[PDB]
């Protein structure tokens, strides 16, 4: 219910 395949989408999802 919360994690990351790689990084890119989850380094830029929040703002």
């Amino acid at each position: 219910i919360w994690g990351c395949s790689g990084k890119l989408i989850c380094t830029t999802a929040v703002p």
């Epitope: 219910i1 919360w2 990351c4 790689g6 890119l8 989408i9 989850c10 999802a13 929040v14 703002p15």
Partner: antibody, heavy 125, light 113 residues
Framework: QVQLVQSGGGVVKPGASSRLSCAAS????????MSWIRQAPGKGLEWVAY????????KYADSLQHRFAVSRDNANNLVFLQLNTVEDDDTGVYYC??????????????????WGQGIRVTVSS | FLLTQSPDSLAVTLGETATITCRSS????????????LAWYQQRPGQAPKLLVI???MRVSGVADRFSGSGSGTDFALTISSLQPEDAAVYYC?????????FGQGTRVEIRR
């Protein structure tokens, strides 16, 4: 460095089976979901399946009536796509692709940042 | 759940501006971040797609500033300013608002010289 190299494909008879392969290098393979996508004519890009980093869950498009099977080998850095009881709809270019995204309780939301070169499959007698 | 690109084909002159429309059947803007879950790809012939934009308007590393994303709700666009010969390709939009990702049918950019 970072790269996906595909093999397999070629001609296949209707109703028969074909196996596609993808070797990964240059990145931590066990950090990424992996997907397969095809490109037919008369309808362009089509996501077919993905596989998780590895608590192996797999998901498929429903239009493919359970006919395709995706598997993975973290060890040799390989992804496979098996096509079963192929039909005249399955002719096209098949890509594996590195799948980047986030997952929560509702599902996974992703994007394809690195693609293999592409393999052509031709359904023909 | 469809993504309809417009137009199918497009002839744009070198140094000028191309615009590629992507309409979604439904809204693709989530609440916990207020971003649209759309992406854009570029496919030069005999090559695999290359990702350019995520979150509808964010450029990815190693992508020129000529490629700009825009829009909200169900209506989005990719523009390409100061057109270059290497932009001659097919451009697809893709949503990731659900687990069932779908692509637009594609838009070809032909170049005038």
């Amino acid at each position: 460095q970072v790269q996906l190299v595909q093999s397999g494909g070629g001609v296949v008879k209707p109703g028969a089976s074909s196996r596609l392969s993808c070797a990964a290098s240059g990145f931590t393979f066990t950090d990424y979901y992996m997907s397969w996508i095809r490109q037919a004519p008369g309808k362009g890009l089509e996501w077919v399946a993905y596989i998780t980093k590895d608590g192996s869950e797999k998901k498929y498009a429903d239009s493919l009536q359970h006919r395709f099977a995706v598997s993975r080998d973290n060890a040799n850095n390989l992804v496979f796509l098996q096509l079963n009881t192929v039909e005249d709809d399955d002719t096209g270019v098949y890509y594996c692709a590195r799948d980047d995204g986030y997952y929560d309780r509702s599902g996974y939301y992703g994007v394809f940042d690195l693609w293999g070169q592409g393999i052509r499959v031709t359904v023909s007698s | 759940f469809l993504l309809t690109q417009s137009p199918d084909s497009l002839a744009v002159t070198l140094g000028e501006t191309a615009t590629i429309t992507c309409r979604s059947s439904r809204n693709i803007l989530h609440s916990l971040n207020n971003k649209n879950y759309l992406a854009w790809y570029q496919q030069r012939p005999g090559q695999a797609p290359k990702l350019l934009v995520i979150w509808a308007s964010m450029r990815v590393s190693g992508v020129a500033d000529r490629f700009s994303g825009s829009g909200s709700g169900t209506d989005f666009a990719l523009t390409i300013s100061s057109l270059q010969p290497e932009d001659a390709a097919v451009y697809y939009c893709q949503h990731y608002y659900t687990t069932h990702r779908t692509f637009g049918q594609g838009t070809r950019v032909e170049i005038r010289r």
